[PDB]
Amino acid sequence: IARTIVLQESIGKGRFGEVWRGKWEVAVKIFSSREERSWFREAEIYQTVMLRHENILGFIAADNKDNGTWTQLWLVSDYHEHGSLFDYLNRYTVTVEGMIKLALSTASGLAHLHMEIVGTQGKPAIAHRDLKSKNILVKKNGTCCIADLGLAVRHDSATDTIDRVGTKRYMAPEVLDDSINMKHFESFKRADIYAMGLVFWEIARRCSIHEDYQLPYYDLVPSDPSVEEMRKVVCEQKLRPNIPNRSCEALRVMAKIMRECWYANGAARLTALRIKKTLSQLSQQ
């Protein structure tokens, strides 16, 4: 695997690890030996039984590569020329149909992650914990696939047990004020929903008349905001990304979804499955 891959271009970096475009085209994330725990954990999540799905980054393999001086810890995946949704939305505007495709595919991927699949070759429910436009990738066919599962948590339904991290800007209210129950898997699922809502906001702005690209809370917090800065806005002032006045039926549906993803109480939010259904219906209309 790694033995026969030739790196060609530096294309980014994760929380840990540098991302490269290589030829085996494939994407490669390289970690140093001191980052073994992060490398292993993400490898572990990607190797979960029945995890593969069209809206989840396609994992190829985890490997080691000794260059003669030091050993590199590798994770290899499919390569998508468009890269992140973040980059995609900055570079282009989208049609109503394109917006629906991006939102539906993301929701379909999160629903798959959240969904426990019962059976001999079953899949446990999984919560992402760091969903953002920067780790969702856009495929050539206009659909998304979710990446970086290194902070994910897996649920054992038989015992309701699992096996402050994350991107500040996208942290759920309960995470920002630390009221979230770290022992309650469902709470992590709900927190993902809040984040996906913000992502939907980023996409809707680009649906073209249209708004320029912006990260959520762009006009309320500084870049690389701290937990406190976020908490004051989201928890104390209780603000959420602004919903433009103009409206289209599709955009109206999106906005409603957003609002229902932004409740301070996770238990009040919509589920990924419900969002997928609603988006599916809209796509048909």
Ligand X SMILES: Cc1cccc(-c2nc(Nc3ccc4[nH]ncc4c3)c3ccccc3n2)n1
Positions touching ligand X (CB under 6 A) are 11-12, 14, 19, 27-29, 42, 46, 75-77, 79-80, 83-84, 134-135, 137, 147-148
Reported as type and span, the H/E element at residue 91 is helix 85-91
Q: How far apart are the first and last CA of the chain?
A: 45
Residues 6+ apart with CB under 8 A from 155: 116, 124, 125, 126, 127, 161, 162, 185
**CA-CA distance, 187 to 267, in Å (whole number)?**
8
Q: Cβ 113 to ligand X, closest distance in Å?
A: 14
Query: Does the annotation flag 19 for ligand binding?
Result: yes
Max alpha carbon distance in the chain (Å)? 61
In the numeric block, the tokens 């530096």 are attached to: 10
- Smaller CB separation from ligand X, 25 or 236: 25
Token digits of residue 194: 């809040």
Query: Does the annotation flag 58 for ligand binding?
Result: no
Query: Does the annotation flag 13 for ligand binding?
Result: yes
The tally of CA atoms less than 13 A away on the side-chain side of residue 3 is: 1
Of residues 274, 96, 280, 116, the one with CA closest to residue 197: 274
Query: Does the annotation flag 12 for ligand binding?
Result: yes
- Smaller CB separation from ligand X, 11 or 235: 11
- Smaller CB separation from ligand X, 14 or 241: 14
**CA-CA distance, 270 to 257, in Å (whole number)?**
8
Number of other CB atoms surrounding residue 238 within 10 Å: 10
Query: Does the annotation flag 11 for ligand binding?
Result: yes
Q: Cβ 38 to ligand X, closest distance in Å?
A: 11
Residues linked to residue 62 through DSSP beta bridges, in sequence order:
75
Query: Does the annotation flag 17 for ligand binding?
Result: yes
Of residues 146, 141, 180, 169, the one with CA closest to residue 57: 146
CB 204 within 8 A of CB 144: no
Active site residues: 130
- Smaller CB separation from ligand X, 5 or 193: 5
- Smaller CB separation from ligand X, 24 or 218: 24
What is the Cα gyration radius of the chain?
A: 19
Query: Does the annotation flag 154 for ligand binding?
Result: no
Q: Cβ 31 to ligand X, closest distance in Å?
A: 10
Q: Cβ 21 to ligand X, closest distance in Å?
A: 7
The tally of CA atoms less than 13 A away on the side-chain side of residue 35 is: 20
Q: Cβ 83 to ligand X, closest distance in Å?
A: 4
Point out the annotated binding site: 11-19, 29
Which residues are part of a known binding site for ATP?
11-19, 29
